[PDB]
Design a binder for these strands. Structure first.
Lengths: 32, 65, 442
RNA sequence: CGGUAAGGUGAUAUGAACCGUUAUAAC
RNA sequence: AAAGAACCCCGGCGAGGGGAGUGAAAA
RNA sequence: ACAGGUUAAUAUUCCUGUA
RNA sequence: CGUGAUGACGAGGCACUACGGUGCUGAAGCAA
């Protein structure tokens, strides 16, 4: 298995990704 | 040295089997076509899904660039 | 002792021993798929709306898309895996995985490196002049986003890998190519139209429909492989009574042909990917170690001799160039292939158990099936080739698939077609495992 | 050669592959 | 009329049995 | 038609060497 | 008795291995 002392539930990575999208999706576009 | 000989032989011995394995329907008036079907069908779904998303977003980007 | 400290700091994915319904593995996969396509729609935050064309060579095997939140794509992950297979391959760092140690060592380790290669590539990309404006400030910002997007994939892969079907990478690649096709041919600036329109305009352009053909041909060719197949077996045995039938007969087959050299060739092509990148990079940022690019790609040097010819039409105007590449790829394939042995691959040991039960044994009755139980050598022998064969077989079909040249990437189409079929199989082994909650190993 | 006909390839006998539905299925 | 008892449990992936359903009835 | 050699199971029968 | 046979086999070693076992090599090889 994995020696990853930390456990991360997928629901997070998904939501964290919805994060990158929103941020840059607006950080870039929607100028001004 | 010998190593190369054996390796070269194995390839030949295999080519021989390919000869025996065919009869059926070379392979079958349904088999081959199948792979292409499922394969193409799968690529279509993945490709189609990409098209939706993709192209609509491009229209907007251009129309607001 | 090992890099266990930071290694234990690198997050992972919570694998539930709960009920993960087919319907859920499916629905999961799909969510990953979309976040992907989506990320491929979003440009990287960068004022310099002007970018120097594109690298028509890295995108395909990388499943990336330069200029987007995934401009680096699977590229790192592949790079990483490439090194590992290189070290743990040429014995340089001999390891007998067997033990959950070496196994989880080889892995965990590689994973880390993937994040290392995640940033490296990022920097290398911008440093290769993938965007044009090297505003130390803006440059930094970009790299951030870039490698971080690739990170998300690394974790999205993990998700699919433990919450859905098939594989992230495998998926991703097929995801990209498929799209690259459906869009290139039919999308906005679609080719089918550019051709169709060119017909209406009255100036029939054979160059607009061409690439579309290239792809059909390639598909039919790369597919021809997934056609053959034995048939098959077989076994036998009866005397049922275990308290409920037990007639016993014996499984069948066959299975198909190709795929094995899948991950291998993915690495060969990916090697070349990191050369054309690493050469240009270490070109407009140093000395011409690898080759003199100019014009974007390379027009001389190791780089030149190792640049796949595809795109639209096959290039005859350089025979020698062809020859070398081919041979160059071929051998590179044999390599990673061998390095896949020292590691792991389609093994008889494994097929032994499972090709020695189909039937019965037991007490009730005399159902035959002797098999079997000491006759494995019959596989490892008949086996060797199967996967292969290879660096020239698989590597050849891929390379020549590029001379011909096609939409999405001759080679890309290949992997895809395979990945897609190995993905169909996955969907079946599942549609069935969704019945008898046990035979999760037959 | 005649009758007959949506059903058939005798039984334990399923499955598999096939033959027929209008006048060379089968009986 | 096979609807000849899916599925769950003890038991030696036994024997046998207890539930669960089929059935007008498993008296 | 002999001596070696060989199969999980055949043998002056199969392989070899020599009749 | 020659030859068959500077061939084979051959104590034992160098190898893998599932632990049924398998490869490379190889001394003496005569007389009463």
């Amino acid at each position: 298995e994995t020696f990853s002392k930390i456990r991360v539930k997928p629901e997070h990575v998904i939501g964290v990704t919805v994060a990158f999208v929103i941020i840059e999706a607006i950080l870039t576009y929607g100028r001004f | 040295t010998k190593g190369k000989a054996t390796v070269a032989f194995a390839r030949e011995a295999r080519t021989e089997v390919r000869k025996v394995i065919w009869p059926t329907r070379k392979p079958t008036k349904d088999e081959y076509l199948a792979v292409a079907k499922v394969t193409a069908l799968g690529i279509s779904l993945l490709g189609i899904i990409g098209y939706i998303i993709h192209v609509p977003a491009t229209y907007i980007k251009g129309i607001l660039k | 002792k090992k890099l266990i400290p930071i290694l234990e700091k690198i997050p992972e994915v919570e694998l539930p021993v709960k009920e993960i319904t087919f319907k859920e593995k499916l629905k999961w996969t799909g969510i990953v798929l979309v976040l992907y396509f989506i990320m491929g729609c979003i440009d990287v935050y960068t004022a310099g709306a002007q970018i120097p064309a594109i690298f028509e060579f890295w995108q395909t095997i990388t499943a990336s898309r330069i200029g987007t939140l995934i401009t680096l794509g699977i590229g790192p992950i592949v790079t990483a895996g490439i090194i590992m297979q290189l070290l743990v391959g040429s014995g340089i760092i001999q390891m007998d995985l067997s033990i959950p140690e070496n196994r989880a060592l080889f892995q965990g380790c590689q994973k880390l490196l993937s994040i290392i290669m995640c940033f490296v590539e990022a920097v290398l990309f911008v440093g290769a002049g993938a965007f044009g404006i090297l505003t130390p400030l803006l440059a930094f910002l970009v790299i951030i986003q870039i490698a971080f997007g690739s990170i998300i994939l690394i974790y999205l892969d993990e998700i699919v890998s433990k919450y859905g079907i098939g594989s992230g990478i495998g998926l991703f690649i097929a995801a990209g190519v498929s799209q690259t096709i459906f869009v290139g041919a039919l999308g906005p600036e679609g080719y089918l139209w550019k051709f169709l329109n060119s017909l209406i305009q009255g100036v029939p352009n054979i160059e607009y429909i061409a690439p579309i053909i290239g792809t059909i041909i390639v598909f039919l060719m790369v597919v021809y492989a997934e056609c053959m197949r034995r048939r098959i077996v077989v076994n036998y045995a009866k005397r049922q009574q275990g308290r409920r039938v037990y007639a016993a007969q014996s499984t069948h087959l066959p299975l198909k042909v190709v795929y094995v050299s899948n991950i291998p060739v993915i690495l060969a092509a990916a090697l070349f990917a990191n050369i054309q990148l690493w050469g240009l990079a270490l070109y407009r940022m140093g000395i011409p170690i690898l080759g003199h690019y100019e014009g974007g790609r390379a027009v001389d040097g190791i780089a030149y001799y190792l640049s796949t010819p595809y795109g639209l039409s096959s290039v005859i105007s350089d025979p020698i160039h062809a020859i070398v590449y081919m041979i160059a790829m071929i051998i590179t394939c044999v390599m990673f292939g061998i390095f896949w042995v020292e590691t792991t691959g389609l093994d008889p040991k494994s097929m032994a158990k499972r090709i020695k039960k189909s039937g019965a044994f037991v007490p009730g009755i005399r159902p035959g099936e002797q098999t079997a139980k000491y006759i494995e050598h019959r596989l490892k022998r008949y086996i060797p080739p199967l996967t292969v064969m290879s660096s020239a077989f698989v590597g050849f079909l891929a390379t020549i698939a590029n001379f011909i040249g096609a939409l999405g990437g001759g080679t890309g189409v290949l992997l895809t077609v395979s990945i897609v079929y190995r993905m169909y199989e996955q969907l079946l082994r599942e549609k069935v495992s969704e019945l008898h909650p046990a035979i999760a190993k037959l």
